[PDB]
C-alpha cells in the first residue's frame, strides 16, 4: 500500500539518540496520525507511541521518558527520537500510517529499519571448543566479534555432512556470538583431528581451533 | 497493564481450517477494535483483518475475524489453508488510554511433514573460556518440526531470570528446524550452582539436558 520512505541509521552508539523518519507523498502530513512500532529480531511487536493531528502524543510507559515524537509539516515527515539507547534497543523499527481507500482506514507500515545499538569497534572472534561428551556432538563457540559475518568451516572444508552452523546472536555488550556443531561417531574421537576454521573478514582474522575430547 | 495472549503455535494441514485466538486479560475486549497482522519472514507486518472483521482488498475471503465477549477474546479463522498462509500472526488492539497493545504472536504452520521432536545437546563452559573469565552454556536444538519452540534455563531447578539469548528457529537442509540458546555467566556464578538445565518445549512436550561444573 503506502510507500512511506522510512529512513534511519544502521548503527547507533549507546547513550546516543536514535532517530528515524518517515514521509508521506500524498500531501497529508497535516492530518491523520503516525504509530511507531519496533521488533527485536526474532521476537514480538512492541508499540512505541503515536502522534496525531490534534497534536496529542501517546507513549508506551516503558519508553515515554526516552521517546520524542514530532511532525515537521515542512519536510512532510514524522520523526522518532529515542534517547539513552542500550543494546536492548536493537530492533527493526516501523512507522505505521493509515491508508484510506475510502471512508474506512487501516494501517500501512514502512519497510522497516533495523537499528543495531553498539559501542563496539571492529573486533575479531575468540573461538572456544565445545568438546565431546553411539554418537557424540562437538563444536565451537565463536564469541565476541563485530560486525557480521563470520565464515566457519570444518577441517578446511573436508567435513560438511552432519554440520550445523547457527545464526549469530547480539549480546548485551554489543558484540555478536555464534556456534557451529558436528555430529560424529564416537569411535572417531582419538582418530580424526577435528578443527574449526573461522574467518572474520572485517577484522582480517583467521582462527583454526582443534576440538579434542575432555 | 492489560495483555492480549495468543497461542505460541497453531498448526494445520492443507485445506483445513485453523483458528488463532487473542484473549484480553482485563477490561472488555469488545470495547476496542481488534486488528490482525500477518508477518512473512523478513517482511513488515500487514493487515489481514481490521476493525474486528474487515478485510482489505487483496486479502482472501478465507480470512475471517470474530469477537466473543463471553471468552473476552478475538479470533482469526483461516479456512481452506494454503502453503502461502504460513506466517506469524499478531493481534493488535488498545487499552483504556488508547495505547496500542499487541498479542504475543502465533506461528502458523501448514503441515507438510510429520511432527518431529527436538534433539538437544547442552555444552558447559570451556576451560579456555573460563580462564578468560567468561562462562557460556551453549544449548543447541535441532531436527524439530513445526518450527516453533520455547527455551527455558534453570539453575538448580530454579528459573534463570537473566543472561539468556535465544535464536529464531532456522530452516535446516531437511526442512526441519534448528535453534540455539545461550546462558552467559561469570565463572564464579557458573561454579555457584550444582547443576544447570536447558529445557526445550515443543508441541506441548519438553526435552531437557543438564550439565554441572563437576
Amino acid at each position: 500500500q503506502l510507500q512511506l520512505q522510512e529512513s534511519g541509521p544502521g548503527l547507533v552508539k549507546p547513550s546516543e539518540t536514535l532517530s528515524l523518519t518517515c514521509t508521506v507523498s500524498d500531501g497529508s502530513i497535516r492530518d491523520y496520525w503516525w504509530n511507531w512500532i519496533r521488533q527485536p529480531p526474532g521476537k514480538g511487536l512492541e508499540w512505541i507511541g503515536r502522534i496525531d493531528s490534534v497534536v496529542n502524543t501517546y507513549y508506551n510507559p516503558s519508553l515515554k521518558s526516552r521517546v520524542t515524537l514530532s511532525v515537521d509539516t515542512s519536510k512532510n515527515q514524522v520523526s522518532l527520537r529515542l534517547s539513552s539507547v542500550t543494546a536492548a534497543d536493537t530492533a527493526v523499527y516501523y512507522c505505521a500510517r493509515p491508508y484510506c481507500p475510502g471512508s474506512a482506514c487501516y494501517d500501512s507500515w514502512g519497510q522497516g529499519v533495523l537499528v543495531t545499538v553498539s559501542s563496539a569497534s571492529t573486533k575479531g572472534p575468540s573461538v572456544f571448543p565445545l568438546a565431546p561428551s553411539g554418537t557424540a556432538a562437538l563444536g565451537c563457540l565463536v564469541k565476541d566479534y563485530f560486525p557480521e559475518p563470520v565464515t566457519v568451516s570444518w577441517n578446511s572444508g573436508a567435513l560438511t555432512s552432519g554440520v550445523h552452523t547457527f545464526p549469530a546472536v547480539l549480546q548485551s555488550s554489543g558484540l555478536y556470538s555464534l556456534s557451529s556443531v558436528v555430529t560424529v561417531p564416537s569411535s572417531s574421537l582419538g582418530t580424526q583431528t577435528y578443527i574449526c576454521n573461522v574467518n572474520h573478514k572485517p577484522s582480517n582474522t583467521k582462527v583454526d581451533k582443534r576440538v579434542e575430547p575432555k | 497493564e492489560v495483555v492480549f495472549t495468543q497461542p505460541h503455535s497453531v498448526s494445520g494441514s492443507p485445506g483445513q481450517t485453523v483458528t488463532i485466538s487473542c484473549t484480553r486479560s482485563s477490561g472488555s475486549l469488545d470495547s476496542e477494535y481488534v486488528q490482525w497482522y500477518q508477518q512473512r519472514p523478513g517482511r513488515a507486518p500487514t493487515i489481514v483483518i481490521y476493525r474486528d472483521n474487515q478485510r482489505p482488498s487483496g486479502v482472501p475471503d478465507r480470512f475471517s475475524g470474530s469477537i466473543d465477549s463471553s471468552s473476552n477474546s478475538a479470533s482469526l479463522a483461516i479456512s481452506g489453508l494454503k502453503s502461502e498462509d504460513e506466517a506469524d500472526y499478531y493481534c493488535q488492539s488498545a487499552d483504556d488510554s488508547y495505547n496500542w497493545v499487541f498479542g504475543g504472536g502465533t506461528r502458523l504452520t501448514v503441515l507438510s511433514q510429520p511432527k518431529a521432536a527436538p534433539s538437544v545437546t547442552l555444552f558447559p563452559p570451556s576451560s579456555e573460556e573460563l580462564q578468560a573469565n567468561k562462562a557460556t552454556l551453549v544449548c543447541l536444538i535441532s531436527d524439530f518440526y513445526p518450527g516453533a519452540v520455547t527455551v527455558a534455563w534453570k539453575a538448580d531447578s530454579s528459573p534463570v531470570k537473566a543472561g539468556v539469548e535465544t535464536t529464531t528457529p532456522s530452516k535446516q537442509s531437511n526442512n526441519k528446524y534448528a535453534a540455539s540458546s545461550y546462558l552467559s555467566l561469570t565463572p564464579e556464578q557458573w561454579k555457584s550452582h550444582r547443576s544447570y538445565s536447558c529445557q526445550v518445549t515443543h508441541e506441548g512436550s519438553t526435552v531437557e539436558k543438564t550439565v554441572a561444573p563437576t
Partner: peptide, 20 residues
C-alpha cells in the same frame, strides 16, 4: 468536500475530525 479524522477513530466512541 471532505471530513478527515484528526485522531484514531474508536469503536463505540466519538472522536475529532476536521472539514476540508
Amino acid at each position: 468536500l471532505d471530513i478527515v479524522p484528526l485522531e484514531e477513530e474508536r469503536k463505540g466512541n466519538s472522536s475529532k475530525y476536521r472539514l476540508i
